[PDB]
Amino acid sequence: LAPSVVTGVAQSSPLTIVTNPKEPRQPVPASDGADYLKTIPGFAVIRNGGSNGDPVLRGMFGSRLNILTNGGMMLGACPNRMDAPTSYISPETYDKLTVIKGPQTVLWGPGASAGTILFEREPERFGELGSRVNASLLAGSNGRFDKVLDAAAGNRLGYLRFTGNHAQSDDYEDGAGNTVPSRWKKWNGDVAVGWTPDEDTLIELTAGKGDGEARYAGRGMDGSQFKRESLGLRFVKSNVSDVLEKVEAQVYYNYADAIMDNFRLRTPDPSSMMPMPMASQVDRRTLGGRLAATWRWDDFKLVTGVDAMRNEHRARGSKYDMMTDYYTDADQFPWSKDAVFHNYGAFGELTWFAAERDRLIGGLRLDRASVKDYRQTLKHAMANPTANDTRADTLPSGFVRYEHDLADSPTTLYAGLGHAERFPDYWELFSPKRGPNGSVNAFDKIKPEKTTQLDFGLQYNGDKLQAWASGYVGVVQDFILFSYREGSSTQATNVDARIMGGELGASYQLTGNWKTDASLAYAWGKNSSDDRALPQIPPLEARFGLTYEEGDWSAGSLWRVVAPQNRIARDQGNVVGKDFDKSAGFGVFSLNGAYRVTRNVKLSAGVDNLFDKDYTEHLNKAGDAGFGFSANETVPEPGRTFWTKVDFSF
Ligand SMILES: [Ag+]
Ligand SMILES: [Ag+]
């Protein structure tokens, strides 16, 4: 048995990682999706403040990543991406996290250039009439407090389950004793009812909200409200035919409604572009489906389905004026629509179990995408040449992967070619203020980026030693890249890019009591078009861990070691961030213990950043002038932080 703290997650299958978000993690997460991914090699995070980060996988940011909650997409609605998809996910509420690296599946939606990420809950198994609870409390160094409850009752015909959480922390501060603006607070509550006529069938209905706020150190506005809210329906039938093994059907709805201002969690900077009190409200309405059979016969297994998704965006803003200090809030004016996306697709994956030690797997996807611009005007107002204009395109995507187990050792090998085309997301067509040269606006001329990438690596699942390693090389056509000029404007452009990199990790049981493990993660990119390096690539990262287990208790030690990043393109990046200066390298150290008091109650505790290191991570965003930041100094990471946690389960 013997508990412990999660310092890093290894690659289990080829290209794939799974982990239980419900165990405690050593640099302890700001109960946000991004942070729960820091503990997986190859993920870096852009820091905005105390929480609500924007995750980066293998140097690839944003819509290059598929973040699926229970099966559905959940898109936020800041034009500057304050609410990333992950911003709405308290992972402790979910039951199983899973990541598939590269363009090596087509089951879970379109344009997964960089990888898919699947937050899930297993449906209850009951039988007798009964119940189960499990909960956790966390108390941490900066006013940090976290309640999480998950419970369910049911019998062998149906179940009911509620899950929720409440989390907050005050403004943390760093290694120089600077309070950094970074307060946050989050809660979520979701219910699920499920019907199991017999063990062959299952229908489940689900619903919930959350809210949250967050001061944003590197931004002119803060987030007063991130109202999330979701409906969901899913059907599952097993063993219909003898060649037909299961059929999955799924509908989902996800509403986001965010308010941002410069007066509800700060005051307006008098020397700023917004000395006025401003607020702006935005929302995103997302609707979607998925329907998919999985056939198994002879030596094969084929899953085939379709999916569609519509999503719509609206915004509205406040108004403060000349002679009087009368401020009309953005709830007084009507919503304005600016953008609708639809997407239908069809997909199939065939895997052949050749022999005992060989797996060949192919998959293809055909997607139709389309987008209508509803901005009659542009922000005090200009005319939008693209009003009510539509675009569309058809994007095929697919892959192949060969996997081979070895003669006389517990080794697998695998190589994969993947093609993935991908339509521009809301922030590629609307958030840029300029398009490519000679274009009217980014909406009209921004091409779908198409990446082609090779993936290889290996598993070693021995006894004392467990190692893994995966690499990649690829080229990206029409990569979409923001470029910055001095207000301060952006320009989106298509450019061509080479990318390579990889990650590896090992884990060695020394004695029955002493375990250790390490991990390295590298990424590297090039703008083949201007002959520059690609911007916003995380530098080389290395994590070392020692661990001692002895009956019911566990002691832990962790070194994170980060190289400098010297390949940077200045005044270029994505929608949220640009590059400017080269990263300094650093090292942070941490300890942890955990102790199992009884079956039902375990305790954990950790110090993060023992030696109170002043540092910032390269991708972190530039702090706000009015908040006491110099020109281009980036948001710093926390200093010494203590935390302790208790998990119950009955
Ligand atoms: Ag915003
Ligand atoms: Ag503003």
Residue numbers in the entry: 66 to 444, 450 to 556, 560 to 723
Published text:
The CxxxM-HxM configuration, which coordinates the copper in a tetrahedral manner, is highly unusual and has, to our knowledge, not been observed before in copper homeostasis proteins.
We hypothesised that removal of the cysteine could lead to much lower affinity for Cu(II), so that after SEC, nothing remains bound. To provide support for this, we determined the crystal structures of the OprC C143A mutant cocrystallised with Cu(II) or silver Ag(I). For each crystal, datasets were collected at 8,800 eV and 9,175 eV to distinguish between both metals. Bound copper is expected to give a strong anomalous peak only at 9,175 eV (which is above the copper K edge at 8,979 eV), while bound silver will give comparable peaks at both energies (the silver L-III edge is at 3,351 eV). For C143A cocrystallised with Cu(II), no anomalous peaks are visible at both energies, showing that Cu(II) binding is indeed abolished. This is illustrated by Cys143, which is essential for high-affinity Cu(II) binding but dispensable for Cu(I).
